[model samples]
Target chain A: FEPIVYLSVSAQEELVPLSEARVPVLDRGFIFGDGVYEVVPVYAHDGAHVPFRIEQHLDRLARSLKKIGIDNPHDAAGWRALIERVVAANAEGLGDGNALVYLQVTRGVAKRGHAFPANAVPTVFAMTSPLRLPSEEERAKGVRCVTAEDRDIKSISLLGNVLMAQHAAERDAFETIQLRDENVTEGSSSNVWIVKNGELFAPPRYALVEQLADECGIRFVAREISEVELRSADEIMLTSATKEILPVTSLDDLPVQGGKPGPVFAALYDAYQRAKAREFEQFDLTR
Target chain B: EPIVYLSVSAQEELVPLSEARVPVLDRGFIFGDGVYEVVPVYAHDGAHVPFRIEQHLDRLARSLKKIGIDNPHDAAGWRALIERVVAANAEGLGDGNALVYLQVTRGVAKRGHAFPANAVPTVFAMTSPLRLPSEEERAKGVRCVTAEDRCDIKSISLLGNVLMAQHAAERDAFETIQLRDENVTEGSSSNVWIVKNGELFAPPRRYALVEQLADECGIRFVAREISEVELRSADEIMLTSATKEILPVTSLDDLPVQGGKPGPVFAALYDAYQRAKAREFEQFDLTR
Candidate 1:
């Protein structure tokens, strides 16, 4: 996928290219993982679909900054401007208007130590990349799943997730569905959901999926799902801003709903695509 | 102590920190998927003593292997690089002690969860001026906070420790003494040590405190899980690290620890630490 990376410094007006991106080695982001990131999915649809849930993603980023005690580098309006600029700068290559805007902020460079440096500036980095969706073949046959641990925070300290994703790729799987003590948590890079008795159940992170399930006229519930229920579910699906909605055909060699995308998975996915156009129809695409 | 701006050397190129630039895409900056070591360099009798330099390098290698980052250089090569860094910053430091920090990361990759194929690891090293604690400050003793879990990885994923340290700072404390439930695990940036009767007790790791004591101080070492209750009632509590060396924690959560003053165990340990540094310089043979 053709992509572009941007770096924004405290004194810079426009985002600089990755070739110009450089941070002090003492940056808390590099030294201490002292930063938070947000991924905003942009769907190509001039007035048809917007970057899904940009505000919600930013809100989560704010909470992470608060939890880690780094002040939000930009106000909501300021962040909106920056996101639009990055997305627009790389929009030409996106082709299908399918890209994700990633933003990160750290407590900036300072003396090497664990304590927060007084009056330290925050380092801001942003980038845009093509959103890779599941191929029709994979959607028809569904993808295989593995397991990882639950990560409560969306901080850049992503080594755990990195290791899990690496392991899944090595094993020829698309995603690693994480579990906490036999209870289904989430997927490596997406949210995991199971359909049983024609109802949709997911671990408690994806509000958009719940909204899509409701849109499809399917009952949606956020609750603790056991590994046993997941393995035996009639249908399983994954959700992400990038993945959109994908079906899971197998879990640890066990076939899910005869190893094919089930009816509920298809229905919710269709509903999600339709809702994107409907909800974004009136919004400005370049804003 | 005066604050001094330092220089960073990356991939063997030494440059001023004001001019330093790490690729924004480097995995070290993006994912915090890296390991680092800080070797303390003490200057005594006109010679710089890099204490336990080899041991620190070995630990760095172990951490890299755990995180799938191959070692970038041999032990001898690392020693040479460290010596150069020390020499470069030694004079400006005014003959005072300093710390040589070395970090290795999985290098840059396209934005993804999986490790990059054939990625070259990024190695960066630098020196920072170190000011040993004054006699008066050592007598007052340090402070501690119980925050986060015991991180055995020593990786760059240090947000947990950073938060703990910030919390401690807000409370006017020196360090965060981490605990897992009712059991004392370790400190946010240093290792926790307790002295009962005369023997030294530490958690189950060859952490900063345990190393100084067992290797140089001749302090009796007992490796076991220390409970909160045992710690609160201990005769003396101390914190250890490359920077702090060994400082006593005379108080916990504002409550005075054993009358809130430096105790005899720390006095002996501190004197022994100085002795060890002297011996280290005499035997290190940095000319190699």
Candidate 2:
């Protein structure tokens, strides 16, 4: 049997990593999904690291981490070290490909208790890997998704999200958009946005992951939209940290209002990038 | 940190000790809107000690940021605080070292589930004895009963384990083994493990919380969705976590595991764990 290796703190800190070291005790993110994370692509190709909306990723991470009762690590430089260390540890193993950095902050260890353990440490880990983007054809043609009702048991949920994603796969779909009783809320992995007469709309953010609503700056319709609104929309949108802005061409397994990536999505996609590019300069990167 | 089972009225007694004068102290205390951590007390007296103080502090800060808390202190600040806390606890208990417990709450703002803006985050620190599991139990191993997962307040939720714990209490089981859907996730508080074909196995990242310990132990873990059936027949079962670093399961759900005793794998890790605890807690100075 391959025996286990447990590194002491000093040893771990001093020992140079041959490969990325993963802690096997991430309770929050691993078990109850008790964490928030940020993913940013550091497009450092061509001898320079230029990722899309890099600063925005940190900005959002701070906000999300704040909302979850976990504070950011005091040193942003250390965060960068962990993020870059993954690639630095495995330069040959990972090889060269489009890459991105992902960082997660989780409410740390306490005996498996649901209640917040006051004075607990939040777990911080950052890793980088080659980015996996869909082929241009898939992105251009747009992916199809199925709609499922949100039935998460927890005050918060990710298992439900995972199940919805699984449901989408079963239905030959790429993603699953979960709607409330009547409101078009969000997707298993993507946020849902609708377009009506070129006015961008997403469901209200007062519900689950509402914090995302506030941070993303998407328009939040406070009430449920009528089916008429769904059918009479100009376009549809899907979003995530990486997806940035995506147009939904179909709904309910049918063609969306315009049946194509409409003007609203195109306009918003461009607007989102420009805003993201300037968001860092406009806002404080270190909060 | 070892999760404590206390009623709302009991937890309120700590208000006057730290002297923070928290407004929503009881709310965070009762509802568990806060988060916390526990560091093993390994060093005492004047000595160069090594513990994962940095990692624990980083985790604390990260959790604070997640919950919208403006933590005024950093890793070094809390390390000093822990030094005092540990000293006080050891002095009180006549022990050389003890575990340090740290907590941070999303400040007492306007009482609503909505984001509490401009609220002063509450910070609390306490220390207590670090009692390892009995050496006898370590040698003989223990048994656990399985419970179904039925938790809703997952984010900051900590109550679901009570029932399982109670079930174990009723049956004299050492831990409550709970299954998430069909996956034998883990003992209510202990990270679940299995030994098969001489290779130690744990459920994937999405299941119980085993990834951190497995990696720390340098145990090569395979990530695959699991069902309870797989664990019912496991050759060896173990729990690896913060408090229960790693414990062998003699039997599961009232039936003996494959070997029906602390297996070879558990023995090896327990030895590894001893060396680990010694090396890691060097800074804590557990020895008088």
Candidate 3:
């Protein structure tokens, strides 16, 4: 499928063709990884259903920008308008498919130096591309994953993350589940959870997974699940905006309890599908 | 003096800064899937001689290779590009000390995590004015991060470096020198060295040190773990990199080393580095 891009280079709104969107060579995002970005899943089809958890994503983006000291370029309403413009730009030819909307805010172009330039005008860019959802075969069979240290895993200092993804790609695996001190932190790009003793155990907190568990009537406990515990669990699952809810039946090539999606994954996955279908029901561009 | 026009170049053409536009989707801009080099072009008797340019290119190629970015240009080809960039921004240097900045990314892709199937490798080059520190400033030394893993890497994932650099700048220091406890490691953007008696000591493989200083700066190199105690009481100190090759560090953390003057050993090393560049660059094929 084709793609479209939108740029907020000025006060006016414009959806630039994906190929021609340009940023200065000296933009901080280009030179250093001094920017924050979010990937929101859009469930647009015969009509647009908008993003799944855009508010949460917007909050995260704001917090990240504040942490890095770049003034937020837009308020909630302002950002929604910008995102809507990009989403609409890419919605022209879509019949019944979804896409991922990408939004990035950089500390704009300035002279090259590690020191923060005294004053910088933030540059905002938004674009969208066709989303490639996991195959039903991949979902039903579950995925194979590996473990790595969870050092600087959150930020966009992503070379380590890139290398981890490459590690999985080279080994013909799905994702690299990261660990620290024998404790599973997360995957290269997804959150990890384990099913033990017929109960769902996950890390401290995640909005989507928590909500999914609550609505599915699954018992959820937030605590540290050791690497060994995860590998020996009855079932394992990974979650992200794109992955949504996926089972991990193998770790380090060893099967997790008969090497297949367990009953827990089925219940959660069915509930997740219902929740997704609810979001796109009678989807329309405007209310 | 104010900078008038910075010379900017896309892959092949010498475009001005205003015209230097990179695709927003360029992996360098997206995932920082790239590497960069800065070579300070020196003017001796009104002629530009880039300092240790071959070394910079070699390092750039290695970084590109590590990230699977096909080297877009060979050493000579790189030399051709860099020479043009330097020549384009050659004039208007008050003291003939300016640096050429070059970066390369693994082309633009359709927003995916995997390395693109094939890449064009976008190249962006530009230049900015550099002011060599005065004698008084050199006597004050620059201030200078991290764990042992990936210590020697020069990748474009530079958030850690940026945070440390910002921290130092906020506190009014030239740079941040990373260390583990009292043991000296390396500088934020350069190499750190200390002189004890008459011998030069630097961090080794794990606490990895850089090579150019030893190869050209005429230093008696001893690769070893240098402690804060020894550093504080050392005879001299220096920071080495392309931008500030062999700069004297007389004081660190507000404490003067050997009475706060550019020590004899540092003077000798910097003087040797200058001579080495003159000899090596004199053989340049600056053909246009």
Error of 1 at A268 (Å): 66
- Order the numbered candidates by lDDT, best leading: 1, 3, 2
Tell me the number of clashing residue pairs for each predicted model: 2, 61, 5
Worst 10 residues of 2 chain A by lDDT: A144-153
> Fnat of the models, one by one?
0.16, 0.02, 0.16
* Reference-based lDDT, residue A129, model 1: 75
Worst 10 residues of 1 chain B by lDDT: B141-150
Highest-lDDT candidate: 1
**Using Cα atoms with residue i matched to residue i, what is each candidate's TM-score against the true structure?**
0.51, 0.32, 0.51
CAPRI-style class, candidate 2: incorrect
Q: State the lDDT of candidate 1 residue by residue for B105-205, as single tens digits.
A: 77777764345676788887888777654433222221111111113343335434544554566565666677776778776656778888878888876
What CA root-mean-square deviation does each model show from the true structure? 29.3, 25.1, 28.9
Error of 3 at B219 (Å): 65
